[PDB]
């Protein structure tokens, strides 16, 4: 559901002694992992995680792997600099993360660009929607912000986000089309559970759907109304979700669940079937 997107989620975790950090880069197309690099692998290289990525030849994988080697060193030096900004103990455990990517518009051009960092799981510095200014989240990030405003680092990222990011996302959508167009509709059912004297829980299940985007609703006599669980992976590439309501005993037939999902020609409507 929504605009096509590409994202790269990168992490470096410092390790003890003279050991270099562990660096992991994960790429996503339309919220599904499609490439991965892990410095802990026997032979570290970017690998195709979506099988349609095997349409890319050896030069692609070499180029991306060389880039990951560069990112790993950028993260290593950046972690060392952060240690000094926060006056922290060296040889310790620390995490640096980056998110970057693009959403596409109806003209196949950039709709929104993303470029942000976190240290110890907290916002550090982020490129604003204008792709020109920076949001420094705390006082140490002011050091980076001044350095990057003076060096013009935003211009480099703006060029990547408006150019390469958009162009490669379009290429991947074309190559992955046969897979990316295949949707799995949710299979839904309502279960009935003892709750109290006079009350029953009705739980509306949506199982085995792809993509993850879904809406579950409950209505009483056609009017909107509820416990929801976070959408969760089934383990086979599809997802699950449920929504439950507490209902008076004898009024179960007055409630309807509606499931909205892009794989469905029309939303599903169902009720408790004794």
């Amino acid at each position: 559901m929504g605009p096509h997107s590409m994202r790269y989620f990168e992490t470096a975790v410092s390790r003890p002694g003279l050991e270099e950090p562990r660096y992991i880069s994960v790429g996503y197309v339309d919220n599904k992992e499609f490439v991965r690099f892990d410095s802990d692998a026997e032979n570290p290289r970017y690998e195709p995680r979506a099988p349609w990525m095997e349409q890319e030849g050896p030069e692609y994988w070499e180029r991306e792997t060389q880039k990951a080697k560069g990112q790993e060193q950028w993260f290593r030096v950046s972690l060392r600099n952060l240690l000094g900004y926060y006056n922290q103990s060296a040889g310790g455990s620390h995490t640096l993360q980056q998110m970057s990517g693009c959403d596409l518009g109806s003209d196949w051009r950039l709709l929104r660009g993303y470029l942000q960092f976190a240290y110890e799981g907290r916002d550090y510095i982020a490129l604003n929607e204008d792709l020109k200014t920076w949001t420094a989240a705390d006082m140490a990030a002011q050091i980076t912000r001044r350095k990057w405003e003076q060096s013009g680092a935003a211009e480099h990222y703006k060029a990547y986000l408006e150019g390469e990011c958009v162009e490669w996302l379009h290429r991947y959508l074309k190559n992955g089309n046969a897979t990316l167009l295949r949707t799995d509709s949710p299979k839904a059912h309502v279960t009935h559970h003892p709750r109290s004297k006079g009350e029953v829980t009705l739980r509306c299940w949506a199982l085995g759907f792809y993509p993850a985007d879904i809406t579950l609703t409950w209505q009483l006599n056609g009017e909107e109304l509820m416990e929801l669980v976070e959408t969760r992976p089934a383990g086979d590439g599809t997802f699950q979700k449920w929504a439950s309501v507490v209902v008076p005993l004898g009024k179960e037939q007055n409630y309807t669940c509606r499931v909205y999902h892009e794989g469905l020609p029309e939303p599903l409507t169902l009720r408790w079937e004794p």
Binding site: E64, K67, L82, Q98, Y157, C165
Partner: peptide, 11 residues
Amino acid sequence: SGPDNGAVAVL
């Protein structure tokens, strides 16, 4: 194709 931070400053 991921970003290349290397062409620009470290934190």
